[PDB]
Amino acid sequence: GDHRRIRGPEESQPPQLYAADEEEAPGTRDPTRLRPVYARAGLLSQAKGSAYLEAGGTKVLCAVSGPRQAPAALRGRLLCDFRRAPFAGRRRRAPPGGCEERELALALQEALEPAVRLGRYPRAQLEVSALLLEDGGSALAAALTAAALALADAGVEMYDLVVGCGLSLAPGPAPTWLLDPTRLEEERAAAGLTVALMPVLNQVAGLLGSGEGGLTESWAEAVRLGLEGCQRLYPVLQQSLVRAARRRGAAA
Amino acid sequence: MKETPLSNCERRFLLRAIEEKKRLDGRQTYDYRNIRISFGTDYGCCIVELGKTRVLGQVSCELVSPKLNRATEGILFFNLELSQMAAPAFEPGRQSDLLVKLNRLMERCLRNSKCIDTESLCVVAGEKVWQIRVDLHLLNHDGNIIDAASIAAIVALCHFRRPDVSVQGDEVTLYTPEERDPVPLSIHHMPICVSFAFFQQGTYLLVDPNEREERVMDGLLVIAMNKHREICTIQSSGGIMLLKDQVLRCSKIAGVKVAEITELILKALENDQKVRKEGGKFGFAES
Amino acid sequence: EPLEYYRRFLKENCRPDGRELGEFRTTTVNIGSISTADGSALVKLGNTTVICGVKAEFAAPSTDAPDKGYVVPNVDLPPLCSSRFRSGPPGEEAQVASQFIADVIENSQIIQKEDLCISPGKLVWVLYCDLICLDYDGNILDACTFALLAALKNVQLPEVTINEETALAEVNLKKKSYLNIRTHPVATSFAVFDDTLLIVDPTGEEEHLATGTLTIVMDEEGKLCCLHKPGGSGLTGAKLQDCMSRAVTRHKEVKKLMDEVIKSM
Amino acid sequence: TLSEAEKVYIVHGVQEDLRVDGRGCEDYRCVEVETDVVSNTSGSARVKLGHTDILVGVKAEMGTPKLEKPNEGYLEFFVDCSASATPEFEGRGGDDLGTEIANTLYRIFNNKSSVDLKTLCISPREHCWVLYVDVLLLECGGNLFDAISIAVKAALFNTRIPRVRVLEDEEGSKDIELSDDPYDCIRLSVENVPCIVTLCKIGYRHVVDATLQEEACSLASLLVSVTSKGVVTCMRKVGKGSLDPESIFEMMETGKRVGKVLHASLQSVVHKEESLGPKRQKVGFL
Amino acid sequence: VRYCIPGERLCNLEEGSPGSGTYTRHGYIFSSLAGCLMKSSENGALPVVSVVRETESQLLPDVGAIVTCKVSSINSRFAKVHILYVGSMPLKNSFRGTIRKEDVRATEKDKVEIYKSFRPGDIVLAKVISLGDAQSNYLLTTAENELGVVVAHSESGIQMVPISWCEMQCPKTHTKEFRKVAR
Amino acid sequence: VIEMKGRVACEISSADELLLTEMMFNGLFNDLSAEQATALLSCFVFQENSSEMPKLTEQLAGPLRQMQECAKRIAKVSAEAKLEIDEETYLSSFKPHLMDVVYTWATGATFAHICKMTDVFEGSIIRCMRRLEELLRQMCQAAKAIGNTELENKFAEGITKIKRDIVFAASLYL
Amino acid sequence: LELLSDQGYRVDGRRAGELRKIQARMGVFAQADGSAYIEQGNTKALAVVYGPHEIRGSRARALPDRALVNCQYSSATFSTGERKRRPHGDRKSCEMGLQLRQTFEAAILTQLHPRSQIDIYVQVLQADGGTYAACVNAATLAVLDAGIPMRDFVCACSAGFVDGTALADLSHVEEAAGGPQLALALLPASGQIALLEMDARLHEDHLERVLEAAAQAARDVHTLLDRVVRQHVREASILLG
Amino acid sequence: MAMEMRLPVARKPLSERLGRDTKKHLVVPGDTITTDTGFMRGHGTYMGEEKLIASVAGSVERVNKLICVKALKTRYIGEVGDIVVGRITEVQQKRWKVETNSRLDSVLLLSSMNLPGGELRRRSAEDELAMRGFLQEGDLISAEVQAVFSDGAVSLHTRSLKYGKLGQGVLVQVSPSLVKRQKTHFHDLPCGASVILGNNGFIWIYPTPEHKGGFIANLEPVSLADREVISRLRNCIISLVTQRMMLYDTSILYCYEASLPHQIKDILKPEIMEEIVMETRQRLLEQEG
């Protein structure tokens, strides 16, 4: 029993597991397709920088609590707190977590440390806080992109932006690499993958993957496909940042 | 915050008065302080104060699914809290060593000695059994806890009464204290610890040390006993080198001490029952 | 020199933002924005923002009241709301607000727990209403309560049945049923400066440099669910009846808003 | 940690295809494998890779299966990163690395084709087997993940689950029937259990078994998980630095080859040892 | 006018030089912030490009400055302060300064006494000298008679008036507090 | 290469250090009192002759015999290697003519009750005692080096006994 | 099942007054300043001693008079047949830490390493009874391997009481039976006890017996350990030159 | 490529391959050294009830009247002229804090470190700020002790320009009880390199230059013919130490000369290690006597 939250029931299982049906399968689509993206920077007020990204059922926030006092030893730091709202996903999980939240946090940190330049932010720790309001597919990639937007918004220095992209594998007899999929295409999947790069200097920053199976060539094709997707996505984020800067110029 | 430091003057004076076999308040070495046992209104509450050290003890019950390894006998849950009113240093989550050692010692003493009947408190063997928890709280800290904590847990667990229950097959019916008379517990023997403090590597030994004597002592010997001369636990702490004859003598002391404390406890319970059988929601005993 | 700078506006019967000491800021909602959840509601008062997601699950009741479907609220003030919060467990304000929401849920009686029992003694619903702040510019309790109510109207639940042969229950995620709520508790906040100056919907700074705060929940049928009065320079009933009147007015306003919204869907 | 000029030395060495241990860029070091160390477990193993010593215990307990997958059991992983490795670990500082390693080990086994769990089911929805794996760190000398993986595989190969007949009966009375034949205990295949492979990039050349002194000199490291066939279950990336898109492919090919070699060697070794028998005396920590 | 982005190149080194908020790669410059760029030109004709996020563009309290501040903590040695108004333009990035013991009056007497010059919770204005190295501790000085405390609240809650050089009084009741009054 | 004895002798520069270290590592000062050590060191700092050799009590003379035995050992070891050294001189290059002086001075007595016992000038006594205090500091540091503590406390106490009034007064030029 | 056959034998096949063959070693882990290993039967303890070194995050705890002993305990999950979790942070491992700490602060002779951490670490790989004493002894061997001064072998062991007799170096079976078990740790040279834990009900007159029995068992343990240590020192010196 | 796995073989203790039967006096705590009239105690013992009781494991040594012990594993106690190699850990406003295999944090006062060339006037604030840009945190210094404080710490300095900061080279960390107390720890071997043997357990190995104080970093490459030698020396030192034998010029030179047939990598496998060490030991023993 937790003594910092309200007294609820010991255990609670959802109703779906008590359902009786073969859930609907997506079917067919253009494998090299991308979902419609709404990215806006400057949403939140009380934060030095914030960003919001929506792609399908995916809905993610990120805020940046700026430098807070706390060479190669007087080098900045950034600690990232990924956190999925308990009302995302078919199932509910207590807020704490402790299994995948921390894994994805490590991922974000490993993908952000390269882009950000911390020599110019010594003796300081940037608190990055991501929040996943709704899970609808590629989540870690949305989180990378949103954190990048929030950083670039707060005005922390960089070398280039971070663009992510998630891929899955069709378990059909002719397995094809499915780009920017949905939670259904992702739970009915064999393998998953996530790339994240910096498109100007064309360098990966952090990737990840897993598989019911695969093979070298397949993984390589997946990688390059995700790279092309990230390239095709970059301009949206560019325009978003320009727009937010124009609104700031307008405010004063 | 922090405890005020100890001056070398007081330290040396204490060591000398020990050398000369002189305590501070005016008692000998083989003597406790006046311990008072006062009761509350609710069956299961006891405030025991030895000198300045006051400790509160509450006993509560619940019904819960037992643990598979022991589906016949029930459960018991100790807990001791060091309230910030006991002393400044007792901030939450800071003096954890003392909490750990005290709680383990008390658990050991009472539980593993089989002081109460974990079997008598069975209701449905496999589904629902009792659960007796005991919360001790430290209010004022002047010296000896373990003795106080133990006397409190014992006075409580001997001054507690369960809501009666009826059963047929699986049909279990609980009832309220106003509909029937709550049933007491089942004790076999009441153990209560006894604390000895060693000074100058083992040369001198005192009983029921105050706070200063605890600050200028190097070692602590706890010994649990009954009125039937049955060692229940003994522990040495403080990183001290004692011997055999020392523990033998300390045990022959704890014998008498526990006998006397036990007589008192019984008298206290007797007086409380007598009072409630005459109108009055209290009970008081004095050393 | 903030306090002084602020009294200047106060004595001009205004505020440094453009509010006439007795009116709130732009209040807006959004219902059904989220699919993964049973009920969803976004509320925002200008810069302040809150979002409630209410999930529905099964659970076994107690022995004192088998016919009671639990409603468990929890408030989350993550560090992205404001810098006064740090990554870790919940602080004090989150916990107080959680208990406030729960006290409301229990006293206003907006919902009958009995309306959540399927098979008494065996199953009952549990509504995990998780609220999250996203901009703590001030007056978070009003927003929390209003978002809770909104989502708790949005929520429509499935229907379940019991089979004696299987001795288990089945759900029908196709057909559903809304959730009946009787009372519509709205919360109205107040900040009391030195003696007699009560401002309504106080933002952040106005609460930082204030002598006391007050919150009042006012059900529709001229009743009160909670008068949260944590400390303060003091008040007499004369400085309280006015707050109650203003609370009734705010009740009317926000109920009209919520009706318009649930009808624009 | 270490200085900058030492890093120059090491990176030019790699670029020159030499290393302080006078080995190339595709060469592990003698890894002392042992199995059947601890006795109270249903499986165990130990590895000493240079200056990293890992122990691994495996306990086959009986538990309820998982509602979404009642037709088969599950593996759980715990990782005690004992402070005996480096004092900078304690009751709170090692949780980070332990969690990381455990999440990896899970990600290696959400594959459905590695350990045939269907073979671990007794009575669906009612009882099943559960493999509690417990990794225990005792030194940290680099190439940690590869050694942990090798230990997991050696322990699985050395795992002996007993046969049990769980017979149902009316009025809710259950009975378990053992087979009094500790020699007749079942054995799970490991022909797919994968080995990890950590390619750390130094300069413009990639390296395997990245000793600490060389990890500090690097900027990225690609972890691959290979099976003896040649597929690639997992592909993770770790490091506070960047990484080009082309070098990924070389890293993956090298991981493939190294995994082939590693699995061959391990299989041969452990068949040898299983052949010897109790004549080996099980020299451990002595 | 054009707003830039942390990855886009801006110009060759042969057509400009990095001023701030940028970096260099092979034969090119690359921005490092989301903001507005500007290429200033010297009489030398070689431009200096830079990028700025004009939200809080830049401020710099130089030596011969006059900066207000608030007295938080004090000691027999020094009194620490927070920077609010550098001149008259506030700066939400409140810098933290210090005032030494002897660097308190133009007379430089050691007889000076902090508790009779300053108190915690009053506003002064002073002249910075040293920027600082590790914590950027501004060291301010008040070696002038038109410097020091300007507003000061009374024993509990009343604002006082600067009667004389080292005296101040509340108008409601009568009580002579001691400060390093300004002017 | 050096050995412990070397790191004990190097700390000494005000006298013959080989013989001091041998006196240590043969266990002389480990059995005497505070002042007797001061006297046995006076046997070294002092280098002037006097008219009448003194008469010394046993408690204070005995140690000097062990001192002379160690000196003879050093002399033989020096002659084996042919240092062109003589034994009688080396042994008698150490005048104990002030042992009693220093003893009575360390007992806390009056300079006038001291300048009489010997037909020697005063400035020579002052030089003796100053060199003696320097040597005592050095020997304290040596004992600090080897690891002993009783001996260094002993020598420091001797120092505290010497400096009373005039042997260590200030220089009017300062 | 049984504990004391009428003949005098136990289950394992040993009388009351004897114990199980400890098999040890010193020098397991070289990346440390001191290491050891011991198997006191089926038990398998493992000790480490990171020497007297600097305090970081000083946090105003560097004692200026003496040294700072920090001993940590751990019982692996797969130690017992019943798997458990949270081996550290529990309310029992911390008590073991306290015990070891007040023992070695007594023995380790800290007055010579002021403002310095002596970090002791103990991991129990397999437990079959006598889990505290094995750890005491492994940590002792470690300290010794680290050339850390210490007054005397702090040798520990356990005793018990069954059928009016005293058993030495209990195992898990008679440890689960619930009978009185008395664990202790003493310094043989002087005959002084550094620790005395005990947990179960028994009469008083039956105390001296188990007490002297545990003491004698610890003496035997001393003999075995010192033979090991002497072999180790001899081999090392021979290898030097 | 090449990977190899192998089971663990059991040790062969007692070192019977030598057969010495030493003429020493070993002890262990509790052991009673000879109790006689006034014997002085040294490091590695103590007193109880008029009885001299050991405190540490090793051989006893009775200098003329002083009884000490010489343990087999310790942390570097500070002498007064011993050279030393050190890895820096912190940079305090006044000085540098350095890590030796010592029981505390060695100290290099800002007054001690030599200056570029001989530009010696005095230390000012500008030097206090260059205190970092020159001697980065984590760097290495080859110094010699200046003095030992009563609190145990070691203040060390730099007598000349032969000392100071170190180049790129390579390093090893061994136990400090495996370097013979002798002179000229700074060697320049004919193999094509040079070596520094700390009185602590830090050995440094650097290629020998041609010109003949660290104030400039010559971060140039190193000929393969001078990195292979360094790596072989590194592995040879590790071999020597794994077999518990002393370490100095002749030992390392002869293990080197022994490990030419066996290639640059295959001489850590315990069989090759042992046979090389045996060859070196035997030839030292027979040539020296």
From Swiss-Prot, chain B:
Residues 1-268 are annotated as: ARE binding. One of its GO terms (molecular function) is mRNA 3'-UTR AU-rich region binding. One of its GO terms (cellular component) is nucleolus. The keyword RNA-binding applies. The keyword Magnesium does not apply. Signal peptide: none annotated. The modification Phosphoserine is found at residue 65. Transmembrane segments: none annotated. Belongs to the RNase PH family. This is Exosome complex component RRP45.
UniProtKB/Swiss-Prot annotation, chain C:
Transmembrane segments: none annotated. Its main location: cytoplasm. It is found in: Cytoplasm; Nucleus; Nucleus, Nucleolus. InterPro entries: ExoRNase_PH_dom1, ExoRNase_PH_dom2, ExoRNase_PH_dom2_sf, Exosome_comp_Rrp42_subfam, PNPase/RNase_PH_dom_sf, Ribosomal_Su5_D2-typ_SF, Rrp43. One of its GO terms (biological process) is nuclear mRNA surveillance. CDD domains: RNase_PH_RRP43. It holds the Pfam family RNase_PH. GO terms for molecular function: identical protein binding; mRNA 3'-UTR AU-rich region binding. Keywords: Acetylation, Cytoplasm, Disease variant, Exosome, Neurodegeneration, Nucleus, RNA-binding, rRNA processing. One of its GO terms (cellular component) is chromosome. Component of the RNA exosome core complex (Exo-9), composed of EXOSC1, EXOSC2, EXOSC3, EXOSC4, EXOSC5, EXOSC6, EXOSC7, EXOSC8 and EXOSC9; within the complex interacts with EXOSC5 and EXOSC6. The catalytically inactive RNA exosome core complex (Exo-9) associates with the catalytic subunit EXOSC10/RRP6. Exo-9 may associate with DIS3 to form the nucleolar exosome complex, or DIS3L to form the cytoplasmic exosome complex. Exo-9 is formed by a hexameric base ring consisting of the heterodimers EXOSC4-EXOSC9, EXOSC5-EXOSC8 and EXOSC6-EXOSC7, and a cap ring consisting of EXOSC1, EXOSC2 and EXOSC3. This is Exosome complex component RRP43. It comes from Homo sapiens. The lineage of its organism: Eukaryota, Metazoa, Chordata, Craniata, Vertebrata. The gene is EXOSC8.
From Swiss-Prot, chain F:
This is Exosome RNA helicase MTR4. It is found in: Nucleus, Nucleoplasm; Nucleus, Nucleolus; Nucleus; Nucleus speckle. Component of a TRAMP-like complex, an ATP-dependent exosome regulatory complex consisting of a helicase (MTREX), an oligadenylate polymerase (TENT4B or TENT4A), and a substrate specific RNA-binding factor (ZCCHC7 or ZCCHC8). Several TRAMP-like complexes exist with specific compositions and are associated with nuclear, or nucleolar RNA exosomes. Identified in the spliceosome C complex. Component of the poly(A) tail exosome targeting (PAXT) complex made of PABPN1, ZFC3H1 and MTREX that directs a subset of long and polyadenylated poly(A) RNAs for exosomal degradation. Catalyzes the ATP-dependent unwinding of RNA duplexes with a single-stranded 3' RNA extension. Central subunit of many protein complexes, namely TRAMP-like, nuclear exosome targeting (NEXT) and poly(A) tail exosome targeting (PAXT). NEXT functions as an RNA exosome cofactor that directs a subset of non-coding short-lived RNAs for exosomal degradation. NEXT is involved in surveillance and turnover of aberrant transcripts and non-coding RNAs. PAXT directs a subset of long and polyadenylated poly(A) RNAs for exosomal degradation. Belongs to the helicase family. SKI2 subfamily.
From Swiss-Prot, chain H:
GO terms for biological process: CUT catabolic process; exonucleolytic trimming to generate mature 3'-end of 5.8S rRNA from tricistronic rRNA transcript (SSU-rRNA, 5.8S rRNA, LSU-rRNA); nuclear polyadenylation-dependent rRNA catabolic process; nuclear-transcribed mRNA catabolic process; poly(A)-dependent snoRNA 3'-end processing; positive regulation of cell growth; RNA catabolic process; RNA processing. GO terms for cellular component: cytoplasm; cytoplasmic exosome (RNase complex); cytosol; exosome (RNase complex); nuclear exosome (RNase complex); nucleolar exosome (RNase complex); nucleolus; nucleoplasm. The keyword RNA-binding applies. Keywords: Cytoplasm, Deafness, Disease variant, Dwarfism, Exosome, Nucleus, Phosphoprotein, Retinitis pigmentosa, RNA-binding, rRNA processing. Disulfide bonds: none annotated. It comes from the Eukaryota. It is found in: Cytoplasm; Nucleus, Nucleolus; Nucleus. SUPFAM superfamilies: Eukaryotic type KH-domain (KH-domain type I), Nucleic acid-binding proteins, Ribosomal L27 protein-like. Pfam families: ECR1_N, KH_6, RRP4_S1. It is linked to Short stature, hearing loss, retinitis pigmentosa, and distinctive facies: An autosomal recessive disorder characterized by childhood myopia, early onset retinitis pigmentosa, progressive sensorineural hearing loss, hypothyroidism, short stature, brachydactyly, recognisable facial gestalt, premature ageing and mild intellectual disability. This is Exosome complex component RRP4. It comes from Homo sapiens. The gene is EXOSC2.
